[PDB]
Amino acid sequence: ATTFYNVFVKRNSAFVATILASAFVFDMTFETAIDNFWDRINAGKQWKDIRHKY
Amino acid sequence: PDPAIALHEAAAEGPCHDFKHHFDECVERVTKAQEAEDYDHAEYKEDCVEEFFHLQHCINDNTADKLFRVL
Amino acid sequence: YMGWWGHMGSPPQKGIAGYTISPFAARPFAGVVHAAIFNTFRRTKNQALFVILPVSFFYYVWTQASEKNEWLYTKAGRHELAKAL
Amino acid sequence: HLGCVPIGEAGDFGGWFCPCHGSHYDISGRIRRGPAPLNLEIPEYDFADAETLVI
Amino acid sequence: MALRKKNSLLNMANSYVLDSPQPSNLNYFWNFGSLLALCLVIQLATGITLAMHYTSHASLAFDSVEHIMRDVNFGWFIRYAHANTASFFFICIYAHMGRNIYYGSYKTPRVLPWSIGVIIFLLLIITAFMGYVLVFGQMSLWGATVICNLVSAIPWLGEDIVHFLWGGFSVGNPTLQRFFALHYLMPFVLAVFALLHLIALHTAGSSNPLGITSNVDKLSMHPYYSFKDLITVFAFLLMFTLFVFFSPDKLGHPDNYIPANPMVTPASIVPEWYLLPFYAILRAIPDKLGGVIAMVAAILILLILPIVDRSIIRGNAFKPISKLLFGFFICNFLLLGVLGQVHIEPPFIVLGQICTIFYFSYFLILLPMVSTIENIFFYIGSL
Amino acid sequence: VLPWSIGVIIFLLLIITAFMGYVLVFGQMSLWGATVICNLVSAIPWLGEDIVHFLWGGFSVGNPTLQRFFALHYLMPFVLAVFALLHLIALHTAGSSNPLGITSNVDKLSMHPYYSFKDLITVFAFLLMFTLFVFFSPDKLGHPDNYIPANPMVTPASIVPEWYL
Amino acid sequence: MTAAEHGLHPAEYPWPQNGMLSTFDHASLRRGYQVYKEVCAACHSLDRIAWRNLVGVTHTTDEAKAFAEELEYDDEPDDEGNPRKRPGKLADYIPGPYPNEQAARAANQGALPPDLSLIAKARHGGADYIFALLTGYPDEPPAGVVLAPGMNYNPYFPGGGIGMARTLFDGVVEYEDGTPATTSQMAKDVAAFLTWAAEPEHDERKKLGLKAIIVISAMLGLSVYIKKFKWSPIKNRKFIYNPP
Amino acid sequence: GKSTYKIPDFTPYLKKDRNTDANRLFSYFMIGSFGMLSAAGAKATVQDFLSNMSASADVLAMAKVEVKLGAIPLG
Amino acid sequence: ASITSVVKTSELILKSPLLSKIVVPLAKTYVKFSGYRQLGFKMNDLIIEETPNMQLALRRLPPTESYDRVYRLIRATQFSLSHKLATGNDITKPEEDDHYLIPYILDVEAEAFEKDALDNLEVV
Ligand code: HEC
Numbered sequence A: 001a002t003t004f005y006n007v008f009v010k011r012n013s014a015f016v017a018t019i020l021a022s023a024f025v026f027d028m029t030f031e032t033a034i035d036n037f038w039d040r041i042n043a044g045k046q047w048k049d050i051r052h053k054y
Numbered sequence B: 001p002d003p004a005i006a007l008h009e010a011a012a013e014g015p016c017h018d019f020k021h022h023f024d025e026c027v028e029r030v031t032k033a034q035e036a037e038d039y040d041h042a043e044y045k046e047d048c049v050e051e052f053f054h055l056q057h058c059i060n061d062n063t064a065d066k067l068f069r070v071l
Numbered sequence C: 001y002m003g004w005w006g007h008m009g010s011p012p013q014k015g016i017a018g019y020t021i022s023p024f025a026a027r028p029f030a031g032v033v034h035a036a037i038f039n040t041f042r043r044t045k046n047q048a049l050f051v052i053l054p055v056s057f058f059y060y061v062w063t064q065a066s067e068k069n070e071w072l073y074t075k076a077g078r079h080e081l082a083k084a085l
Numbered sequence D: 001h002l003g004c005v006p007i008g009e010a011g012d013f014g015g016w017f018c019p020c021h022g023s024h025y026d027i028s029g030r031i032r033r034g035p036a037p038l039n040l041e042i043p044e045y046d047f048a049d050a051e052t053l054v055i
Numbered sequence E: 001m002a003l004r005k006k007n008s009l010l011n012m013a014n015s016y017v018l019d020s021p022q023p024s025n026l027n028y029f030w031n032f033g034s035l036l037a038l039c040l041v042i043q044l045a046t047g048i049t050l051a052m053h054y055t056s057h058a059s060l061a062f063d064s065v066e067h068i069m070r071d072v073n074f075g076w077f078i079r080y081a082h083a084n085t086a087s088f089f090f091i092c093i094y095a096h097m098g099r100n101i102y103y104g105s106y107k108t109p110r111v112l113p114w115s116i117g118v119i120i121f122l123l124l125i126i127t128a129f130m131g132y133v134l135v136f137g138q139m140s141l142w143g144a145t146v147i148c149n150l151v152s153a154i155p156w157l158g159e160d161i162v163h164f165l166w167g168g169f170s171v172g173n174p175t176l177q178r179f180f181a182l183h184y185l186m187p188f189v190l191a192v193f194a195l196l197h198l199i200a201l202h203t204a205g206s207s208n209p210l211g212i213t214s215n216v217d218k219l220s221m222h223p224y225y226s227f228k229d230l231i232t233v234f235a236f237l238l239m240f241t242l243f244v245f246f247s248p249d250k251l252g253h254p255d256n257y258i259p260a261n262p263m264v265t266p267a268s269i270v271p272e273w274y275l276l277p278f279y280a281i282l283r284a285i286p287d288k289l290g291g292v293i294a295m296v297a298a299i300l301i302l303l304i305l306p307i308v309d310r311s312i313i314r315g316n317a318f319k320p321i322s323k324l325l326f327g328f329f330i331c332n333f334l335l336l337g338v339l340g341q342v343h344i345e346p347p348f349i350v351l352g353q354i355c356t357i358f359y360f361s362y363f364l365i366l367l368p369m370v371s372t373i374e375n376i377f378f379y380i381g382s383l
Numbered sequence F: 001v002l003p004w005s006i007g008v009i010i011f012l013l014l015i016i017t018a019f020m021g022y023v024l025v026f027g028q029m030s031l032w033g034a035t036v037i038c039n040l041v042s043a044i045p046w047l048g049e050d051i052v053h054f055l056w057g058g059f060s061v062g063n064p065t066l067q068r069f070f071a072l073h074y075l076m077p078f079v080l081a082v083f084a085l086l087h088l089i090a091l092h093t094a095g096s097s098n099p100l101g102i103t104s105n106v107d108k109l110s111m112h113p114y115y116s117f118k119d120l121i122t123v124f125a126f127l128l129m130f131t132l133f134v135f136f137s138p139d140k141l142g143h144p145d146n147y148i149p150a151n152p153m154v155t156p157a158s159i160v161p162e163w164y165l
Numbered sequence G: 001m002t003a004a005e006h007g008l009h010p011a012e013y014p015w016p017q018n019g020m021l022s023t024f025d026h027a028s029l030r031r032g033y034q035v036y037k038e039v040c041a042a043c044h045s046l047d048r049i050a051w052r053n054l055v056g057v058t059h060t061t062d063e064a065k066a067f068a069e070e071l072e073y074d075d076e077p078d079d080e081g082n083p084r085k086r087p088g089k090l091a092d093y094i095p096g097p098y099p100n101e102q103a104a105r106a107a108n109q110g111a112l113p114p115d116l117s118l119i120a121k122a123r124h125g126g127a128d129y130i131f132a133l134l135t136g137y138p139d140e141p142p143a144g145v146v147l148a149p150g151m152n153y154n155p156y157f158p159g160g161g162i163g164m165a166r167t168l169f170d171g172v173v174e175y176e177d178g179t180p181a182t183t184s185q186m187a188k189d190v191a192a193f194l195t196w197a198a199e200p201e202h203d204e205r206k207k208l209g210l211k212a213i214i215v216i217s218a219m220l221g222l223s224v225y226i227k228k229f230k231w232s233p234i235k236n237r238k239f240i241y242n243p244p
Numbered sequence H: 001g002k003s004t005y006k007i008p009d010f011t012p013y014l015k016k017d018r019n020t021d022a023n024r025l026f027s028y029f030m031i032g033s034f035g036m037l038s039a040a041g042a043k044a045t046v047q048d049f050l051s052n053m054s055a056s057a058d059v060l061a062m063a064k065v066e067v068k069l070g071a072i073p074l075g
Numbered sequence I: 001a002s003i004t005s006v007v008k009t010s011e012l013i014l015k016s017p018l019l020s021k022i023v024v025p026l027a028k029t030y031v032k033f034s035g036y037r038q039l040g041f042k043m044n045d046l047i048i049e050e051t052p053n054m055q056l057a058l059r060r061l062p063p064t065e066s067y068d069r070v071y072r073l074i075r076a077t078q079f080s081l082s083h084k085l086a087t088g089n090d091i092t093k094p095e096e097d098d099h100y101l102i103p104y105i106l107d108v109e110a111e112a113f114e115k116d117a118l119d120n121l122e123v124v
């Protein structure tokens, strides 16, 4: 906790770096997660689901 | 055949029977009134649109979900 | 009528001691459940009539007007409509 | 060079001559003389038939 | 000395957004001012963006809006954001004005920010009216026709003024191109007046819900109201999201998706919902000129609140009768809104007249009476 | 230093404002000037080409470019007026300098009426110059090629900027 | 106004796309295009839709190019400046049945069939209105209704007399996916397709809105925590007054 | 009531572990998460919004061009 | 409206037996429902002060009254921002609701209004 504070939080430069890197990771993972979830709740309805017929 | 034909008929004879009767009575009156002479020179000519709307609104309430379920 | 820090325009203050604790020392959500239930109930109870009375009156007026208007434009309301115009 | 259109058949290398600053392109449309740094860019083109190309 | 205080430019920002001394007890109704600033920023960003893709010529206008919806990347978002934020702007402005009337923000020493505020409200109405015409659908055209014809009621020169405004003999291409140019400009004028009312306010500072001085107990604007403003910003963005992404056309009229046709008249020509109370007031007066005067007076009468409120106390927190009258006034204003969009039929015609009388009698009779009596009740009651 | 530094930005905003406004005519100089000046951005390494296509909203100067320049040309003068105001507010801390370069704190004159009425003389001198151009020689400062409609095929004999650039 | 002047209000049907998280059913969209093409396109244009719009919604790139290439469009003039036609391309718009309004009205006893690209947004009711209208022609008009010449009774249409006759009858279309083409089925499919034509961003819009809702909600929760954290010294303040 | 050295009761609000790194770290986790979602939200907003200025779908459709070659003479 | 006006009208009502019989009970209920006592205010604390006349009257308060008013304003502000009411001794009891300020403002206004009258005098 001290260690974590000292490395990632104490210096604002490090805190902002950590926040931005987390935002990058969140952005990429959230994209992928929503894509999968959206495809499951709307299964068989979307073009990608009927495309194989044509 | 069109699923709606049967669903609509069922709803008219069943949950919307009171409205069906009112529409029927109205049509009987209006047709009879049209049959009578000097109808064309009357001030007020009754229609049955109101009663028809009451019936249709009712049929639609009892059918909409059932119909889309079988398409 | 307002100055700035150091000379805000307050009458002279004397004899008040003010105390508080650091945001890091405090529980920000202390007493939240009691507030959310009992405080909100008290605050809402004490203002309820000032909302209820005008809303209920104007809703009743609208209801009466809209129902009559609907009725006047039916077959049944032909005669009353003719007089109204 | 800057982005005028060369007058074809003109030049000094008898391909294309840009009148704007006097840059001469070849029959390959390669730059030979004048301020222009590069040869005239080639689009992405494919011969669908031998009588028609798509660009 | 700190740089934020020393440097004159920084110090102007500092005086408004950081060191600005605020009452320590502003409630959530003090958050509409920053929501209005947010709406204004959204409208500038989306509006300038739409202007990059919109064509003001009448032959192309409606189709340029379809091009925005269909072909421009995120055009649908920018268009619906702009259209819905116009409605949110009026919800926030009615809330902000309601706050001001309930808490006596119009009383001395804040008559000047309030009076400039009344003009900001008129500029918003004109801005939004002109922007709506730009779509050049059926409601755009027919709305412009009927609203611009109200000017014909100005005696002697009225018809001439209408033809001058139109730049022709009916609403057409000249009118659309001038409305585009003015619609682009008006938000900048509005932002200047919004700034002027704040500068005027800064001499007294914000009022507060108790109606007493806050000179005894001030809080810096930052961080306290900065972080309190974020809560309502996120609440606003959630409401914005529900409309823009899930119900983008709920606040609009389907007829505005039909291209303007000078021949066919729509079934019912109504203003955008936020103008509806003023339209009901206009219909209430049988005379054309009478109706226009009444409609304008309904806004300009806000300027007399500093006079007609006779109270020795600022605001309604401790005035039970004033609170009841305020409740009736607000509900009547919403009834007027509803009556603005009903058909001109019995019994709504007479009801609209009664509601219009109540609207004006609040300012002219009831508030002066009630505020006088409560003065006496406070004095006798506390002896 | 601060009013001067803001001034340098005002000057850049004027250049951009006037550049975009010139494109709006969509004559030959409008188009070819836009082409050549916007292609300078291609020189930005790595991303330059992508930025140019982004600015144009397409692969050459065309309708998307013209409509965006209209919108920005409308906006930029308002931005410019704000910065003009900022440089004056910044100046007001020291006041105007003067031709001798010494302090004027020893000897001040109200802006009105002295500089109000002195400003009128140059306003009328300016209006006389304005009149001679606008009424008697309206096209002396322009390029005849801008009365030919933009043609992406034909390149004009010489593409030069407006004299002030 | 009378209910007749308003039109009967359509039922709320459970469309697949109703639902914060629901897309269109793209199989229904494809079938609805085929109804448009084989029934409606005789009288109604779809002018805001280009062939490229169908691709990856209802059809593959190849199917849509095939549809385009079967038509002829105006080319730029030839070298002698004479008019020319070319085969259609994906960038072309779907061509309408009539050259102008006058021709359209002449073919429809004076009535002008509207363009259908925005009709789902241009009518109260949307898909439900289109479905209700197409399926709501009674065999006989209610006794007493006098229809104007060239009018058909339909209660959903305001006033009741519409210049469009009933057009959907069981098996006017033969669906390519084997679905029984009943009046109801065709009306549902074409109403879905037209709703797509009016709002083709629908599917993407709702998914981006899901992302927005989640992020904005989280930020709302965190903004509440942060506000309470920063405000706690002010809320928790206590005083002792000793009158001087 | 009178003595100003007797601090008012703050026991309903005081955390026992107020001085620990864990205690601070928690509040910075909240602040940091909020900064993280604001950064991700701003990035998404900026990217989607500015993309309006990239070539629209109708401009992207006007690219590939077919030319005959039979008409073109030698030289 | 001026404090002078309010006080004069109130005195007309308190004179009339009939009027006082019907007004005084109403005024007392009004004050109870007003609820300012539940924030520990006295009635006079609520009077608008951003006026030349009221600034002058406040400057003429005895120091003790002045210091206590400052405390009541600060305490009420704290109850407002916390969404709490006063309890116990912080509630203003009816006997504590004294018109400490009315005499000062009535003097300030007396002079201000006499000055206005005498600015309009006509030698006869
Ligand atoms: C052969 C003629 C014809 C065919 C086939 C036809 N329509 Fe129409 N349609 C019309 C005419 C004419 C009108 C205008 C009716 C009026 O305004 O009185 C119209 C009007 C409409 C309206 C608008 C009614 C309103 O509210 O204004 C919709 C929606 C509509 N049609 C959809 C369809 C659909 C969907 C199909 C077929 C799948 C279709 N039409 C087939 C001739 C046709």
Ligand code: HEM
Binding pocket: E029, E030, E031, E032, E033, E034, E036, E037, E040, E093, E096, E097, E100, E105, E106, E110, E113, E114, E116, E117, E118, E120, E121, E190, E194, E197, E198, E201, E205, E206, E207, E208
């Ligand atoms: C674009 C429109 C507007 C913006 C952006 C705006 C913004 C603000 C802001 C930030 C404040 C200070 C914070 C607050 O009290 O909410 C404020 C205060 C005020 N505004 Fe507005 N405002 C707008 C329109 C109006 C209108 C239309 C009126 C009046 C009809 C008005 C009258 C006032 C008044 C009187 C105050 C002081 C209220 C007080 O603190 O007691 N404003 N405004």
Ligand code: HEM
Binding pocket: E040, E043, E044, E046, E047, E048, E049, E050, E051, E054, E065, E079, E082, E083, E086, E089, E127, E128, E129, E131, E132, E133, E134, E135, E183, E184, E187, E190
């Ligand atoms: C206070 C700020 C503003 C308000 C209240 C406002 C309001 C409106 C409204 C109501 C519309 C009709 C929207 C629709 O139904 O489609 C509109 C359209 C438009 N506005 Fe604005 N607007 C504002 C600022 C701006 C600004 C600054 C611009 C800059 C040019 C602008 C450009 C446009 C354009 C081009 C349209 C037409 C395209 C469309 O309908 O979306 N607006 N505006």
Ligand code: HEM
Binding pocket: F003, F004, F006, F007, F008, F010, F011, F080, F084, F087, F088, F091, F095, F096, F097, F098
């Ligand atoms: C829209 C353009 C501008 C306007 C309207 C404007 C206006 C003015 C005015 C009214 C003054 C005070 C009177 C005077 O000295 O003439 C002034 C002073 C000044 N301006 Fe500008 N200005 C503009 C552009 C610039 C630019 C581009 C610069 C610098 C590159 C600049 C730098 C200054 C400086 C340093 C002063 C103070 C000079 C002094 O009094 O010694 N301005 N400007």
Ligand SMILES: CCCCCCCCCCCCO[C@@H]1O[C@H](CO)[C@@H](O[C@H]2O[C@H](CO)[C@@H](O)[C@H](O)[C@H]2O)[C@H](O)[C@H]1O
Binding pocket: C003, C004, E005, E011, E012, E013, E014, E015, E016, E017, E019, E198, E199, E202, E203
């Ligand atoms: C709200 C948007 C953010 C941008 C700020 C708005 C820009 C316009 C603001 C400038 C208008 C002049 O605004 C005026 O500036 C000066 C100093 O800045 C302020 O002066 C105030 O602060 C300074 C120190 O902070 C003190 O010397 C002074 O006693 C006090 O009154 C005025 O209270 C304010 O009315």
Ligand SMILES: CCCCCCCCCCCCO[C@@H]1O[C@H](CO)[C@@H](O[C@H]2O[C@H](CO)[C@@H](O)[C@H](O)[C@H]2O)[C@H](O)[C@H]1O
Binding pocket: G204, G208, H046, H047, H048, H049, H050, H051
């Ligand atoms: C002040 C800012 C300074 C510099 C900022 C530069 C930002 C400008 C770059 C615009 C980038 C857009 O780049 C492109 O964006 C869109 C979304 O917008 C993405 O598109 C992706 O998500 C969108 C929705 O968000 C879906 O419709 C799409 O199917 C998917 O591919 C692309 O994957 C990405 O390639």
Ligand SMILES: CCCCCCCCCCC1=C(C)C(=O)C(OC)=C(OC)C1=O
Binding pocket: E016, E017, E020, E022, E026, E030, E031, E033, E034, E037, E191, E192, E194, E195, E198, E206, E225, E229
């Ligand atoms: C372009 C002109 C727009 C003016 C508004 C911009 C200022 C942003 C709102 C900030 C704000 C101010 C100034 C303010 O004074 C105030 O205190 C009453 C607020 O919060 C309660 C505010 O939110």
Ligand code: FES
Binding pocket: D001, D002, D003, D004, D018, D019, D020, D021, D022, D023, D034, D035, D036
């Ligand atoms: S532009 Fe081609 S030679 Fe310079």
